[PDB]
Design an enzyme around this catalytic site. Structure first.
Site, short mmCIF file in Angstrom:
data_model
loop_
_atom_site.label_atom_id
_atom_site.label_comp_id
_atom_site.label_asym_id
_atom_site.label_seq_id
_atom_site.Cartn_x
_atom_site.Cartn_y
_atom_site.Cartn_z
CG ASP A 1 43.42 41.82 42.79
OD1 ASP A 1 42.47 41.78 43.61
OD2 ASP A 1 44.36 40.99 42.77
CG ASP B 1 39.60 40.62 46.50
OD1 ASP B 1 40.53 41.45 46.38
OD2 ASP B 1 39.58 39.50 45.94
#
Ligand SMILES: CCN(CCN)c1cc(C)c(OCC(=O)N[C@@H](Cc2ccccc2)[C@H](O)C(=O)N2CSC(C)(C)[C@H]2C(=O)N[C@H]2c3ccccc3C[C@H]2O)c(C)c1
Ligand SMILES: C[C@H](CCC(=O)NCCC[N+](C)(C)CCCS(=O)(=O)[O-])[C@H]1CC[C@H]2[C@@H]3[C@H](O)C[C@@H]4C[C@H](O)CC[C@]4(C)[C@H]3C[C@H](O)[C@]12C
Ligand SMILES: C[C@H](CCC(=O)NCCC[N+](C)(C)CCCS(=O)(=O)[O-])[C@H]1CC[C@H]2[C@@H]3[C@H](O)C[C@@H]4C[C@H](O)CC[C@]4(C)[C@H]3C[C@H](O)[C@]12C
Length: 327
Positions: free
Chosen positions: A32, A212
């Site tokens: 992440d 992201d």
């Protein structure tokens, strides 16, 4: 440069494995770029979610150093809690002593946790985004002269076609075709850049765009979305912020993002999710409405499936190039 092979799960997310502990205890991670902490579920975890997972046992690790400082990690999709611990963490064939969260309660991270096959999350953000002031893994690795550059790259897997790779410390031409274009970060602590956003006649100048890896949609400001969807022949799912469409709906627009430097487009094929099960010729849009205080798009998984991405801490920029369709 070392790298970690990325496996697809349901064409919606991807995972990679790494190890925590001197006895090679192996874990599956969400990787992440929008968070900056590493966590694994503990043998001390007493929640239903932990039942199915690879658990960390510090008693079996001789390189374990106790911290025990209590901590709660709050994400948009829920919360996990436990306490800090330190042990050797191994990414690819590189390792370093590292501080991470040993998770004892995952009930606040349901239904995400029990529904997926990951054990933990490995953050790849900036230091000031971390709880407890943890230097990012790639920054530490560079500092310890274990890699050439404080950078990493994402070549995402494509369901039923090829695997992906997280590469640490350097860029490889094999992963992409065409020019690689660097966009400067507009923020101290997010992988966020400035792009003009166009969808049809709807336009948002100098939008914040967050690249992201952990988000499985494109997110769009809610006013912009409402304009996009007007007369699009799409239908919202009851109680949920998802829209359904015929897969070959001819009105589905192409996202175009532009800088001084470059031009990135995202055609319906990259943001549609087939749901043949729900009904024949039906797709879900991987698009959700979300308002930040300043107008922001998240260029999640659907963007990164098309575009190879370079996250460069040293030059405070994000490199973007069209991913090679196959290796
Ligand atoms: C400033 C406070 N702060 C620092 C604390 N000291 C701090 C700390 C953290 C970890 C922050 O990130 C929290 C977070 O959940 N950030 C997420 C990104 C995001 C998403 C929407 C809005 C904002 C950010 C994070 O990167 C992420 O992708 N996460 C968190 S858990 C996860 C499953 C790995 C994934 C996630 O929820 N994904 C779901 C998601 C998210 C958005 C839309 C669609 C979907 C479907 C799923 O993919 C933020 C934004 C701020
Ligand atoms: C991040 C956004 C916006 C949240 C928001 O609108 N936030 C401010 C409101 C105030 N809060 C209620 C948060 C109180 C605390 C902050 S306060 O400042 O008020 O103190 C919310 C709104 C709808 C949410 C998705 C849906 O659910 C469906 C689904 C459920 C899964 O499980 C996890 C994945 C997913 C995709 C969700 C992710 C995320 O979660 C979304 C995008
Ligand atoms: C803790 C996790 C907190 C800290 C910062 C929070 C976000 C920001 O506040 C900006 C924005 C405000 C909106 O209100 C709701 C949506 C959004 C994206 C928030 C969602 C969530 O609450 C976050 C991730």
């Amino acid at each position: 440069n070392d790298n970690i092979e990325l496996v697809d799960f349901q064409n919606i997310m991807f995972y990679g494995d790494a190890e925590v502990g001197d006895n090679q205890q192996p874990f599956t991670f969400i990787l992440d770029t929008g968070s900056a902490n590493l966590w694994v579920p503990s043998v001390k975890c007493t929640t239903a979610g932990c039942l199915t997972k690879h658990l960390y046992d510090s008693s079996k690790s001789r390189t374990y150093e106790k911290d025990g400082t209590k901590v709660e990690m709050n994400y948009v999709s829920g919360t996990v809690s436990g306490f800090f611990s330190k042990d050797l963490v191994t990414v690819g064939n590189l390792s370093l002593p590292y501080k991470f969260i040993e998770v004892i309660d995952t009930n606040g991270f349901e239904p995400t946790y029990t529904a997926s096959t990951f054990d933990g999350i490995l953050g790849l953000g900036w230091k000031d985004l971390s709880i407890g002031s943890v230097d990012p893994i790639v920054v530490e690795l560079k500092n310890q002269n274990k890699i050439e550059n404080a950078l990493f790259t994402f070549y995402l897997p494509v369901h039923d076609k090829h695997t992906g790779f997280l590469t640490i410390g350097g860029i490889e031409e094999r992963f992409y075709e065409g020019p690689l274009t660097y966009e400067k970060l507009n923020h101290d602590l997010y992988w966020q850049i400035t792009l003009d956003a166009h969808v049809g006649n709807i336009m948002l100048e100098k939008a914040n765009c967050i690249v992201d890896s952990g988000t499985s949609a494109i997110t769009v400001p809610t006013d912009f979305l409402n304009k996009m969807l007007q007369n699009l022949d799409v239908i919202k799912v009851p109680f949920l912020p998802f829209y359904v469409t015929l897969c070959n709906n001819s009105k589905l627009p192409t996202f175009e993002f532009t800088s001084e430097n470059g031009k990135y487009t995202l055609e319906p094929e990259y943001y549609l999710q087939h749901i043949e099960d729900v009904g024949p010729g039906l797709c879900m849009l991987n698009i959700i409405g979300l308002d930040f205080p300043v107008p922001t798009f998240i260029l999640g998984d659907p963007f990164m499936r098309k575009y190879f991405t370079v996250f460069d801490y040293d030059n405070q920029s994000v490199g973007i190039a069209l991913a090679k369709k196959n290796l």
